[PDB]
Amino acid sequence: AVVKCKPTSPGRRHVVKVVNPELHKGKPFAPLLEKNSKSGGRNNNGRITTRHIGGGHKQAYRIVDFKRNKDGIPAVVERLEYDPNRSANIALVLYKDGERRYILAPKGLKAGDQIQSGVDAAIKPGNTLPMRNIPVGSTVHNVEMKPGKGGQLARSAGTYVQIVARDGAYVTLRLRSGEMRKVEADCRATLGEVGNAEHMLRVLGKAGAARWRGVRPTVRGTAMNPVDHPHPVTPWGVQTKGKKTRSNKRTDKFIVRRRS
Amino acid sequence: MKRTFQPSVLKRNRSHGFRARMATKNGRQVLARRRAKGRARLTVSK
RNA sequence: AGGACCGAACCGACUAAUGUCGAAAAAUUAGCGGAUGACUUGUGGCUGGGGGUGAAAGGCCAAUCAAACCGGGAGAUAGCU
RNA sequence: GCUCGCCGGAAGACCAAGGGUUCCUGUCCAACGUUAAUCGGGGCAGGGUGAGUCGACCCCUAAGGCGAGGCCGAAAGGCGUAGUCGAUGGGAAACAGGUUAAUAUUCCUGUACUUGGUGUUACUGCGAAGGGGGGACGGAGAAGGCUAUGUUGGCCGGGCGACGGUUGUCCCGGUUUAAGCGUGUAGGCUGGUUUUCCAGGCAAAUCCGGAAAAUCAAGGCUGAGGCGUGAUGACGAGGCACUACGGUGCUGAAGCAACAAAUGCCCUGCUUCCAGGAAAAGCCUCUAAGCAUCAGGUAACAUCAAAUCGUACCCCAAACCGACACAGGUGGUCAGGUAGAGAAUACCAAGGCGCUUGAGAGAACUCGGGUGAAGGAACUAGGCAAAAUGGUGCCGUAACUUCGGGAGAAGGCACGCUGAUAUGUAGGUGAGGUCCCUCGCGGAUGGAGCUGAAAUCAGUCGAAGAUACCAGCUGGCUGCAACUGUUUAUUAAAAACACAGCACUGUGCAAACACGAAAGUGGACGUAUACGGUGUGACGCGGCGUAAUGAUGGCCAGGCUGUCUCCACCCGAGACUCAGUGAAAU
RNA sequence: UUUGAUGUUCUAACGUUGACCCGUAAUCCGGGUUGCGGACAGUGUCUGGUGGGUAGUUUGAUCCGGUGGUUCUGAAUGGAAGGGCCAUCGCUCAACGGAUAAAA
């Protein structure tokens, strides 16, 4: 749901919150938890490589099962949880064998539902089926690019990819960026679209939102001195605002269409 | 105003201690120079 | 609940006065803004000099920064004093 | 020794970091103390630091460092695995009183507590770098029970007292007792018992998890505080006897109730919020390998050990950092009485000090203040500085607006004390007796007693009752900027920087981008509802307006006043004289 | 028969920051298997273009020589290249005694 806060004061005047009543109001499953130490944009050399990163509230990394190698093991979704590392909420799944894991929660998944992975699975949203088995012209997410890789595409909230054609051992997928990609059929994918589609309605209200979310102030090039910044070019002299930098010549064979 | 120097034995030892000097190759050269010059205190220590 | 309000500790020095061979190589008195956070602080480490960091002033890098300090080239050179 | 004054949320007591004998005694003024000094944190000599329970040490580890192999690089060297360091964190244990001139939670008196080795006794399956639980956690906020602590009352010993009265509802001092032990309450958490099965927990498992049933509905876990032992023990006001006259020995009465109550405990509790809030070790359990006449473990007993290091002193300062015995700075803990919402403010208890030059007079002038006739900004680039209001309660509060705000707008009236309402009300707390009880820290009556606002009437004193400190000046026009916030440490706090939002562009992940000769890293253990760069900076249509906001620029109006006509007097330090020490630029 | 450029397919070179197992209680690393691409990408030398991002600087002369004749000479001998002798010629290189072929 989407709620607009009363303008009782600045910092609440322009606040829009995305409240999810069905989220779990409790601690996460401790066994699957793990630490996530912030880096602040530093690297092994200790210098800053990426700008505008630092601070933020402490968060714990949740291990999410993307590969979904539990083939032919029906499971029940216990509940949903808020994962700070992902813009989309996660779902706790308990398999019949007696083991618990985390998955991505699609739009049509709620607590108490039944899920199943493997080729011998139905077409209900959230099931894990190879794109070869998945009917063409369907919407999927968490698509794999190599067998057993785990899944990298359509992992953000409300993101999905369309299966637009079936060229034998390869399949054509349209992404939300307007990209047409050719992917091997043996790769796994998840049916349905990612949940938490209302992630756009949030406006973060004030600076503090981003500040404790992990973003630091951005300084414009014009305000910088000539020595610090060239000032449309990047701080390192690369001309921006309409200059492609894609030079790989390795994965282009899998590229069918470019963004328009 | 708090002055530049704030004493701390741990910091002093770990920054300019003999083991810290010997950890790096250049610190060994610095110790050799100090010994050649003949200063009584090669490095800072308790 | 409020990057909410008045207001102690705490943070800074916006105004005035004294202090310029002062108690202090930016200090003291009363006012002054914040004082639940974009807050501050103790401790422990990382980012090292065409480099680091910088809510960005050409600011800070141990009272020195439009390019630190230490030893060497080096008794640099000076059509200059 | 007696007065006067200051701090007393500190100018008191403990520590942490930092100094290293500055600590105590004897002894002297050679040099220092901005003067003398017999004195000192000064010179010389002596004494002083007692740990199984304090901390370090040791087990584990976060950030981070080193790094066997290994990758890369002309070499130097850079990265990193297994591993090893790394407390700012997690693991086991002590309290009361007494003592020296210096140590005490270390020494003495008493009660204990914890970890392992050894031997005896009765049993038993033991056995991991492996698995499971726990360790193990954010912000904000309200209540209940508590306690430290303090008030009153009763009790104990004393007093009746140099200026009126004070055997009385009067005054002074005390009225303290820990850790451990047993009961385990208030409160919080959770449904338990039994059986059967399961490709799950990278092997197995009686351990965790999951699925079925029969049974009861209670059990189990955590849990401050109080109660008795600790303790007919110590302590204890005061008196008595000697004093190297500083001080030492003996003695020792009562040691209770109520109230209020914390930031400290129940409470890592409970309710909500998105920013979703460390790791490992010790600890309980399961088995693998191997052994099960052993070994090992369990429960009780006796005994041994718990090594080594700091233990003085200062620690908001004279001892630490500032070249100084420097108006500066330094983290945490305890932090009481009255008035007070308050750790603010005014006076005090405990405790600590009068700050290392004084003595005379009270010139101009300088510094910080008090008062003031009339005008009340006419002074000044400028209400700069000064002057003025400032709190509680009742009524009321405009234009605009994003409907929240403006607003404490502005503006009107009562605030003291005593008696009554009410021999202190309402409220809070709550004794004893009585009745029950699934029988103890168990549930009702009850108000004894204590504490205790706010309001009405009447009276009353003062020129003035928020009478002291504390404590917004007010409104209008107006450019800028969404606001909060940050910046040129040490002349520019702003219209500058940053900001949530908006738009363009790039990146398909072995992603772009950046550090790196390269490895490898942050991006991201994310991935198109994700990230980097660029321009602007809320909202309605870089341009026009914009509520609120502003130590922002300017103007005006009401009060106010020494800014000014015009300054005058007074209060403190200099300036002047005397004594002691004693620079400077040039 | 040498063949190269190009097109389709394939693996034995090569990449694997895909999966499984071992050294190994090991996200590194090396080794064995397989799948995915595959003569693509990438790397080493050369070369065309961009490249204030970075670095060194500024605000008939002269060098080069075009042609001629002259065996003057021409580094062992004979040639040739390169030098010397005489003639002429290319720049208002006019900043005209002209500091670089090359700078706001």
Author numbering:
A (entry chain C): 1 to 231, 243 to 271
B (entry chain 2): 1 to 46
What does the paper say about this structure?
The proline-rich antimicrobial designer peptide Api137 inhibits protein expression in bacteria by binding simultaneously to the ribosomal polypeptide exit tunnel and the release factor (RF), depleting the cellular RF pool and leading to ribosomal arrest at stop codons. Separation of cellular extracts derived from cells exposed to Api137 in a sucrose gradient reveals elevated levels of partially assembled and not fully matured precursors of the 50S subunit (pre-50S). High-resolution structures obtained by cryogenic electron microscopy demonstrate that a large proportion of pre-50S states are missing up to five proteins (uL22, bL32, uL29, bL23, and uL16) and have misfolded helices in 23S rRNA domain IV. These data suggest a second mechanism for Api137, wherein it disrupts 50S subunit assembly by inducing the formation of misfolded precursor particles potentially incapable of evolving into active ribosomes, suggesting a bactericidal mechanism.
After an initial alignment and several rounds of variability sorting, seven ribosomal states common to both datasets were identified, i.e., 70S, 50S, and 30S ribosomal states and four pre-50S precursor states. These precursors represent late stages of 50S assembly, with most of the 23S rRNA regions stably formed, while the subunit´s so-called functional core (FC) appeared unstructured.
